[PDB]
Amino acid sequence: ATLATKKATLVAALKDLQRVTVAFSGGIDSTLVLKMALDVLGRDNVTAVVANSELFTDEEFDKAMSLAEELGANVQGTTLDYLSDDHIKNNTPDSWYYAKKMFYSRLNDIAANNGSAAVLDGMIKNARSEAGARSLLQEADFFKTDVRALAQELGLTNWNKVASCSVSSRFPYGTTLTHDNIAQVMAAEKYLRSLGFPTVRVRFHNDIARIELPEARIGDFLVFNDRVNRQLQSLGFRYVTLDLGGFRS
Amino acid sequence: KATLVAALKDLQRVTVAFSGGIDSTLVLKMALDVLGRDNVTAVVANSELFTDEEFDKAMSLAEELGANVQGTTLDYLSDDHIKNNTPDSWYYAKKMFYSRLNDIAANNGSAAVLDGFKTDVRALAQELGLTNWNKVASCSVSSRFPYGTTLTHDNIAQVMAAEKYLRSLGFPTVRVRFHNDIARIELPEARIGDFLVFNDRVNRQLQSLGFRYVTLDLGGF
Amino acid sequence: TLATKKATLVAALKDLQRVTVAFSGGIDSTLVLKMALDVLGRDNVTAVVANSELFTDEEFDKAMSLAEELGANVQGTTLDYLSDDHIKNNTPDSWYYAKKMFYSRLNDIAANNGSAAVLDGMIKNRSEAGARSLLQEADFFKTDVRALAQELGLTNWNKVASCSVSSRFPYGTTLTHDNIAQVMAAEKYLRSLGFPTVRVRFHNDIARIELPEARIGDFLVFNDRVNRQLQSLGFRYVTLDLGGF
Amino acid sequence: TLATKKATLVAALKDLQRVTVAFSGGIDSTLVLKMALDVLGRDNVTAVVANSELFTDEEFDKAMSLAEELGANVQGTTLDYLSDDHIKNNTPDSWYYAKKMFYSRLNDIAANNGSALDGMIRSLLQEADFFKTDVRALAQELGLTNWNKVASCSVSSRFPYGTTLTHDNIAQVMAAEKYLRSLGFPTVRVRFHNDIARIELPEARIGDFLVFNDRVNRQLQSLGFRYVTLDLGGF
Amino acid sequence: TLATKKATLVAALKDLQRVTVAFSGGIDSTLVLKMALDVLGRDNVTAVVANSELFTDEEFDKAMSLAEELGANVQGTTLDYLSDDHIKNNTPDSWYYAKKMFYSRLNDIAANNGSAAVLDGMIEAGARSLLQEADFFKTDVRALAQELGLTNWNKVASCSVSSRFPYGTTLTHDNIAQVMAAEKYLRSLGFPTVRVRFHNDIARIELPEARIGDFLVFNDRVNRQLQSLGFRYVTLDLGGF
Amino acid sequence: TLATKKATLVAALKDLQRVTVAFSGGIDSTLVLKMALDVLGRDNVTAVVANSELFTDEEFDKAMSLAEELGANVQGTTLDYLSDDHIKNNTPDSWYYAKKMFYSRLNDIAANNGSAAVLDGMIKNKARSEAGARSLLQEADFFKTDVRALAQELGLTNWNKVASCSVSSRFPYGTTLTHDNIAQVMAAEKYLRSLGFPTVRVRFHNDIARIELPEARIGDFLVFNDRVNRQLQSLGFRYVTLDLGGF
Numbered sequence A: 001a002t003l004a005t006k007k008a009t010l011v012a013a014l015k016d017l018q019r020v021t022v023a024f025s026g027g028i029d030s031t032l033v034l035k036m037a038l039d040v041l042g043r044d045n046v047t048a049v050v051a052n053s054e055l056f057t058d059e060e061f062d063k064a065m066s067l068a069e070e071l072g073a074n075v076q077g078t079t080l081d082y083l084s085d086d087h088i089k090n091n092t093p094d095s096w097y098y099a100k101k102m103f104y105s106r107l108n109d110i111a112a113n114n115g116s117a118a119v120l121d122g123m124i125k126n127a128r129s130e131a132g133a134r135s136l137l138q139e140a141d142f143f144k145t146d147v148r149a150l151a152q153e154l155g156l157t158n159w160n161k162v163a164s165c166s167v168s169s170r171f172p173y174g175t176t177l178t179h180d181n182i183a184q185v186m187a188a189e190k191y192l193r194s195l196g197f198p199t200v201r202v203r204f205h206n207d208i209a210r211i212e213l214p215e216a217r218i219g220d221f222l223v224f225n226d227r228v229n230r231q232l233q234s235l236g237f238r239y240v241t242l243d244l245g246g247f248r249s
Numbered sequence B: 001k002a003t004l005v006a007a008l009k010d011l012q013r014v015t016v017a018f019s020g021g022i023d024s025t026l027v028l029k030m031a032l033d034v035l036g037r038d039n040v041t042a043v044v045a046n047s048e049l050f051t052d053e054e055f056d057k058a059m060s061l062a063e064e065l066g067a068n069v070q071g072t073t074l075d076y077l078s079d080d081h082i083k084n085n086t087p088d089s090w091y092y093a094k095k096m097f098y099s100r101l102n103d104i105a106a107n108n109g110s111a112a113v114l115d116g117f118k119t120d121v122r123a124l125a126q127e128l129g130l131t132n133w134n135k136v137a138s139c140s141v142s143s144r145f146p147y148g149t150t151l152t153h154d155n156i157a158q159v160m161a162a163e164k165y166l167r168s169l170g171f172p173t174v175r176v177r178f179h180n181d182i183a184r185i186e187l188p189e190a191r192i193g194d195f196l197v198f199n200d201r202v203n204r205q206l207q208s209l210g211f212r213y214v215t216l217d218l219g220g221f
Numbered sequence C: 001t002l003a004t005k006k007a008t009l010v011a012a013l014k015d016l017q018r019v020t021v022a023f024s025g026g027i028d029s030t031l032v033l034k035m036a037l038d039v040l041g042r043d044n045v046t047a048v049v050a051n052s053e054l055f056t057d058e059e060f061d062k063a064m065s066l067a068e069e070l071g072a073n074v075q076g077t078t079l080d081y082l083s084d085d086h087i088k089n090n091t092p093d094s095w096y097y098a099k100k101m102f103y104s105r106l107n108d109i110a111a112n113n114g115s116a117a118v119l120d121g122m123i124k125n126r127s128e129a130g131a132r133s134l135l136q137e138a139d140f141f142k143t144d145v146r147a148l149a150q151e152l153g154l155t156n157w158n159k160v161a162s163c164s165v166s167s168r169f170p171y172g173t174t175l176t177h178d179n180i181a182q183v184m185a186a187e188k189y190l191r192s193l194g195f196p197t198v199r200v201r202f203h204n205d206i207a208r209i210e211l212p213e214a215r216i217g218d219f220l221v222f223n224d225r226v227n228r229q230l231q232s233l234g235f236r237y238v239t240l241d242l243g244g245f
Numbered sequence D: 001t002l003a004t005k006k007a008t009l010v011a012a013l014k015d016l017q018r019v020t021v022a023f024s025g026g027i028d029s030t031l032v033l034k035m036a037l038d039v040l041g042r043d044n045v046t047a048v049v050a051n052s053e054l055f056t057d058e059e060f061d062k063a064m065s066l067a068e069e070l071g072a073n074v075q076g077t078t079l080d081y082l083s084d085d086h087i088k089n090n091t092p093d094s095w096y097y098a099k100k101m102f103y104s105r106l107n108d109i110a111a112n113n114g115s116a117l118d119g120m121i122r123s124l125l126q127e128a129d130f131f132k133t134d135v136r137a138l139a140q141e142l143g144l145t146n147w148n149k150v151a152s153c154s155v156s157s158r159f160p161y162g163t164t165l166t167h168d169n170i171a172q173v174m175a176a177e178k179y180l181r182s183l184g185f186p187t188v189r190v191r192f193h194n195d196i197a198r199i200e201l202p203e204a205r206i207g208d209f210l211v212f213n214d215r216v217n218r219q220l221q222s223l224g225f226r227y228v229t230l231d232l233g234g235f
Numbered sequence E: 001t002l003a004t005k006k007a008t009l010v011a012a013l014k015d016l017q018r019v020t021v022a023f024s025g026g027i028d029s030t031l032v033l034k035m036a037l038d039v040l041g042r043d044n045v046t047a048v049v050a051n052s053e054l055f056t057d058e059e060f061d062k063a064m065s066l067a068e069e070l071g072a073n074v075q076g077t078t079l080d081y082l083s084d085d086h087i088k089n090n091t092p093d094s095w096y097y098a099k100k101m102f103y104s105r106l107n108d109i110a111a112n113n114g115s116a117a118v119l120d121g122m123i124e125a126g127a128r129s130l131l132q133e134a135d136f137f138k139t140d141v142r143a144l145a146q147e148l149g150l151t152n153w154n155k156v157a158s159c160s161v162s163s164r165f166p167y168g169t170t171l172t173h174d175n176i177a178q179v180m181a182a183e184k185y186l187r188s189l190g191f192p193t194v195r196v197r198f199h200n201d202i203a204r205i206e207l208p209e210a211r212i213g214d215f216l217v218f219n220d221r222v223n224r225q226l227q228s229l230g231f232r233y234v235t236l237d238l239g240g241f
Numbered sequence F: 001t002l003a004t005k006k007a008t009l010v011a012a013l014k015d016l017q018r019v020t021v022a023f024s025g026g027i028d029s030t031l032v033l034k035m036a037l038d039v040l041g042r043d044n045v046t047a048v049v050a051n052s053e054l055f056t057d058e059e060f061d062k063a064m065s066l067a068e069e070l071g072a073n074v075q076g077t078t079l080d081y082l083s084d085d086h087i088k089n090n091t092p093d094s095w096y097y098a099k100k101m102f103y104s105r106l107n108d109i110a111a112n113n114g115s116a117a118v119l120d121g122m123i124k125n126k127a128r129s130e131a132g133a134r135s136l137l138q139e140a141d142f143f144k145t146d147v148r149a150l151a152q153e154l155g156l157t158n159w160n161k162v163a164s165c166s167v168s169s170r171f172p173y174g175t176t177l178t179h180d181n182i183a184q185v186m187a188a189e190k191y192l193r194s195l196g197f198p199t200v201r202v203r204f205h206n207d208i209a210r211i212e213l214p215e216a217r218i219g220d221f222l223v224f225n226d227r228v229n230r231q232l233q234s235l236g237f238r239y240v241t242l243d244l245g246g247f
């Protein structure tokens, strides 16, 4: 339960694996996994993969790609067409399962080709598990607090402090995702973020946009009312609203 | 004042469409004062598209002036143009309204039904003026529903309860626009700042009335 | 039946011949004072307005002028509410011990000028003092009060009623001249900033300010000024109740 | 005593026999105009309204309609305050030369109709001991209901002492206040500081102003101001 | 001059031979515990962490965990501060008599474990502040902390819960729980610096004035929560924190 | 490549043997001072932080402590920027004459330290080069990402993430800088900073102070309205205003 033996667990596991492929998201957990992998195995035996997809922002992709380079890993992007699976295109409740399946199926193809012994992700002990992958922080009982601590011990400083999550969550179940509406939602959230709100949602309800913000920031939002209204109207919405129960999940 | 009083003497017996406003109160009192309690019949309309406070306040308000008051109820929702909320709904409603007042007038015996310049009106008001006004004007609840939407007994009650709640918080000028699972709240932009302490309570309150998401329009009115 | 009620009221006044009216400034006592004046004449009506440590000087001056404007001969009287321990110690029965002291003074006043009874504005919604509510004996229903006032031209009364300052103190807490002055000064300040509906609840070294919730947002710009002022008025801590009014 | 002062006003008016009233549209000028009418009769009282380059056209018209509705024969007059250099150059006594020019014209009109009065609290109200609270009482007692709940001061107050007033800056200032008024702020001043607009609001209203920040910034910038600011001490 | 400062610390430690440390979890106690461990070894160092009713269980656990991570022999003990009448009735002397109970227990621990002194972290009970004797400034502590690799201390300061009560009000287990439950709630809304001041039936909240604007959306929710926790009135102090 | 960029830099430091560092507190000067310390040792590196009337005391003290904590012998020095007529007269040239005066002092310090060069923290993208000082990161092709790359590798985790311009930006170009108005502007911003607004400008318009804040922070300012008004009025301003178009 000491942070040191947690680290020791992580190091011996990697030494056993010898060659790894890292599912690199750009967050703190992914950064700790990629950083520790390089520190134990060296740049030649680690491959960082970043997924380019229509369900996450281009900025998240671009900074993650550079973040891996700053960590000293040979990084490789790969593009995933999530909308090619009908459960995702039609935004059923099982969408998450087919997305992760399509994602881990792609990473195992990559690892199988560069000879790697495992795919690595940044699951930590916090209902999620994925058999064809090794979550070494979860496996060594790394808690959110242990990740921040080991990250500071190593000097890792520059990750992406906000998770942002898949855009399918901005559409109701049963709604079909298209390039236009996804682009419509992404343009809206990019705007609200540029005003200073890193945690933001623009939920799609056809002609109504419903914005979720953290309740503690709603007071500060008032100065942007008219600008958000006119801008989100340029993107296709007729009504621009603010959900009074703020940012739920 | 000279012309209006002479016009009243000519009609002798009248029925007044009483709204509670500046015009309706002044005409009803002058009609009562010129034609007498025995010759004036005041009617105030009760309907599913306006709140009971407008109705109940109007019946008690006119009695205070000393006129005999008569309520009548109108099933606007029996007209398909209103039930289906076409843009022409206003016209069929007013048509349905005056045909009811003309039936009433014919049976009571009135010569006419009276309705409600403003600068000349404000002056004649000063001669007496009275209190227990109805200083706020009403609007039909049809405006809270889009044109394609069919009006039901439940959603009208739903929207009216929501506005009645928001009014009680201290926001007399408000609209709760109906979009099925979404409530869209219109407030005057100068009041949106003052609304913030009530956010969570309005959310849980309007949700218990049937709404799934409770929202506030960034453009106010 | 409105005329029927007014006639009853008139028959009561004419019969009594001389009256003293506890004039509050409100619509009801104003209507009573107007009808009393109209039925018996200025010389046979004495309107009394009570001055006490439990209400503001502004409130007293306002009632005194409202009686003067109707054309009534008006007389102020000062009451030492704090001499009775039931008020001084602010028990929950304080409301009645205050009203008992009030009607007894009205009977002393009435007894010396010659009035047949004391008049107040109680309404069909005191007995121990021979006080009569002519509006309530004739089933005036608040709607009739607004009605007879319009008939008579009564247009200008005291639109907001005055609560006693004892409501600013918790039960059992003893009132001193300074506590009352502290509280009233605090509310006079807060009203002057633009908050006509306000309370400064007294909790010894704590001030607890009650506002209409919709006005708290506007209140923020005055926190430090209000804090320093109510602190200079005797409070050590100045707080704002999260549950408003 | 509220009637003892009414008697003073009525006694003074009968003595004057014929009157000319400087009617501003406010509570005080309204009370005088009504009393002159009822004590002296419509034929012996003339209400004069001053129009000038220093007050709003809306302010003039609201006064004109109220005087007629009170039943007075009312007469408009225009004053070119900008022709006196003390007014145009806004030195500190500019108020005195404007008021002098105003009463000199009001004395002119009155002599020609034949009258032998203003709303200060000659000011027949400030003689009978009216202290603003007495004025509202006589206003309620008399049935007066409609006047200007917001007091209109001359726009020369928006410029620092020494600034010369032009039609352009005056219009600029009046356009800005007219804009801010339409947003829900009836009490407002836009102080002119060349390229800087300094906006005074009642402190109780500053909280509500935030939703309009960017709109007024771009609007007052379009009227000629470069920087649009809000005075922290407000009105 | 910094390298001579470390030397004073090393000599003072070597002279003592066996030590017990009052470990707070902060940077100073971390530096003292780490250097004692580095000079004397785990077998000659005892880290003491106190559990008491005036500080949180969360804070207790974090000091316990920080001490284990440095590799120290750690000894928790509980202190019943409310058995001293100065603390229970919260006179103004409470702070000093509380510290006396604390240093008496640690010196009792030190006498039985075998240590020469009780060490604490400060830049009449035999306690010794070695960073002080050697003249460490806050600037010098952060410097030696990085020289050693320390990154993980307790960045949050901790006041005793006696500060939430006025002098003369007596502290009980129940009102203390009430005050701490309230502050933890407010912290969970997002206000890390907060006090819930106890005035019997009145709750008085001190906040950073810059966050009072942001607080309004929680007004009614805080009212009902702290009312449910025992308060009758929930108030906000206008002069902030 | 980065392994061999560190290499060029470490080789360059060994050649100079003794150095003086222009320490700003930012990541770039932090990387250089840290590498000089790691390659040449504490005895051979002298960190200099400049105090002046055009920058805050907070920025000065924060840089001094960052160098102390990094393990460098740190030495403050003060510059009288207002003695140069180009700086006092707030022309568009002022920045250059300031940097000339600044590097001129670093060279005197260096001559007394015994150092072979003056090092600054400039990276690949006249005052610096007229004085002969050297940007060692520029010389190994360090780009912003290579600075961040190496900062993690050395453990550098604590630098000064906020940049800070000279006070002359609070004055229009025609205005000549005086000690009294500089004190006026700086006291005000230090005041506003203490209220909880780290990003602030007090623009000087003679009798008018015009305050720039982030729009997202204007809402929070309300409880401080009357105190900021009276405080800046006590500092010499007649009117204290807030720009509606923020920062």
Ligand SMILES: [Cs+]
Pocket (backbone or CB within 6 Å): A129, A130, A131, A132, A133, A134, A135
């Ligand atoms: Cs797994």
Ligand SMILES: [Cs+]
Pocket (backbone or CB within 6 Å): B047, B048, B049, B050, B051, B052
């Ligand atoms: Cs109804």
Ligand SMILES: [Cs+]
Pocket (backbone or CB within 6 Å): C051, C052, C053, C054, C055, C056, C057
């Ligand atoms: Cs009094």
Ligand SMILES: [Cs+]
Pocket (backbone or CB within 6 Å): D051, D052, D053, D054, D055, D056, D057
């Ligand atoms: Cs004009």
Ligand SMILES: [Cs+]
Pocket (backbone or CB within 6 Å): E051, E052, E053, E054, E055, E056, E057
């Ligand atoms: Cs505990």
Ligand SMILES: [Cs+]
Pocket (backbone or CB within 6 Å): F051, F052, F053, F054, F055, F056, F057
């Ligand atoms: Cs300085």
